[PDB]
Amino acid sequence: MNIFEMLRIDEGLRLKIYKDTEGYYTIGIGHLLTKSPSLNAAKSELDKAIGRNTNGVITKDEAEKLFNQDVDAAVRGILRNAKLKPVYDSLDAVRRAALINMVFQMGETGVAGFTNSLRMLQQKRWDEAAVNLAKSRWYNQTPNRAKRVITTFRTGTWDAYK
Template sequence: MAASPGAVQYGAAAPDFSTQIAQMKVDATQTRVHASDLTSSETMKEALAEEEGVRLTVYRDVAGYSTVGVGHLVLPEDNLRVGDTITYEQALEFLEQDLKKAEAGVQRLVGDLPIYQHEFDALVDLVYNVGEGNVSERESPKLNAAIASADYEGIAEELHYHHAAGAKANGLVYRSERRQAIFMEAAYDDPRPVEIAVAGNLST
């Protein structure tokens, strides 16, 4: 007798629900997850490009470091000097390389502390901007203490970095405000005031 449609097939392999559950991707915008499960969002990449700009000619940043692309600090292996130019594709390659380093730095920084996507993004911006060394326990003890105690508000308070080469930089003030807004509210918009110039052009 043939089994009717929908009839239970005894002896058939039972579905492995534990595997199915493990394969389900948790929505990190709604649930805090382990940092190792996260990478920078596309929205964060756009915000980062806005902050750093995209420059194809090697220049010196406010701290005097040779820089190119999306805030990429020129390394000896890049074989580039101030005044040299790169392609847009090279700029994107540098960005992806630097993002991977920053993401790994954030993963080491937060350890097992679960975080939202936007919290991860804000911390990636921090590490990308100031370097992993500057968020170490020695250099940023309050930030590390907040992470250790799972004090998310305390973490947000420690995301401000305003100085470059020993001087306060207005651009870093706005960037810090944006970083904190990303961390606390998932608000990626640029906080800089926009004014209408006399000629009718937008200016900041």
């Protein structure tokens, strides 16, 4: 198991523009296109991201290319963030994947706002961190995914993804 396989499990794969869990236009493996209600705005963003007139459809290779870029962006966003980088550096490899997963889903700024949870993770108070992480809109809106990610923070294993 690795961060790519982990996010593939959590995000799935769809080759046509679709709406994410928050109603936002998305494609591929969790690639947010826009928060705009305009499907035309989303199609424009898609063509810009792929480099061709897609009309809302991409190939599997194209979806994997955006996914590689998005995972890359999530890691670089963590390392460039003054609140996330100390936590990331303090963690083991499995729990680092859980943090990357959170940033992939909700963005650098959103995760960096989990101040109290981040402190608990930094302190390696795993059960306490897991309890704090669940007191969130994140958990209430995507509980099954949040449970898998939280279990990964609690245990430092991949048990929730096997």
